Amino acid sequence: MKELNDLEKKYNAHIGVYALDTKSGKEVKFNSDKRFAYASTSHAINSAILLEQVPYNKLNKKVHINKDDIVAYSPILEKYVGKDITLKALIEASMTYSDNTANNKIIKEIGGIKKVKQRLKELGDKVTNPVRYEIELNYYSPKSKKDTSTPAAFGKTLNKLIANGKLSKENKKFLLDLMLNNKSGDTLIKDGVPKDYKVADKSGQAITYASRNDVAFVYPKGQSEPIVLVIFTNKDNKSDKPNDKLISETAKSVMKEF
């Protein structure tokens, strides 16, 4: 982890890494028990929990969207005020466009923040701590645990929900294809891993402390089992700007371990 220490020194940043090859069980950890704001990488978790309870063939069920649901940065859902949207389109908006209104509506469908924390506990995750909806969950403070998790607890939860969970084959493919085709993560994990690798990711950026994250299921050439990879990073000052090359370079070093 001498390359990771050096990357912190090089980017003047803090890095939290958890990587699990689900084939061998091999793990690479660096500051894996340190808390970081997960930001919108949480959209992946909420989407998976809902998909555990709605069969693929029923993803056509619609939900009404009204003015009260709209929150900042909802490029798709702002067009749906007073209209109905299917659960499938909500999930696509939330993952592909990081639409915040879609994610909150998904949390509501699941039953609220309370029901999400319940399911995390059932999965054995007592670390991930959702308290707020979007976009307030992005107001991160080092002195608060609100909406934070550690790279290991978040990585183990993604593994249990998606890589080795109870989702059907269709739902799992559906979610993963959204993650594979998302362009917002191109400068992140996808930029650092080799060209033979498929990267299904969900990026995130909080409002404060240059909180820049990327979680992904990486598929090396020849392996069909994904390597779960969670990279959370932040800086020491509230208004610091993040450098994505930090995550691209982190993914590259970590991949050398597999």
Catalytic residues: 40
Give Cα separations from 92 to 52, 151, 183, 247 (angstroms).
Answer: 16, 25, 13, 24
If phi over 0 gives left and psi between -120 and 50 gives alpha, with beta otherwise, what is residue 163?
alpha
Per the annotation, does 185 bind a ligand?
Answer: no
Residue 30 is encoded by which pair of tokens? 């660096």
The secondary structure element, H or E, covering residue 155 is: helix 151-158
Dihedrals phi, psi of 217, to nearest 5 degrees = -115, 115
Is 124 flagged in the annotation as binding?
Answer: no
> Is 112 assigned a ligand-binding role in the annotation?
no
Q: Which of helix, strand or coil describes residue 30?
A: strand
Binding-site positions for substrate read 202-204
Binding-site positions read 202-204
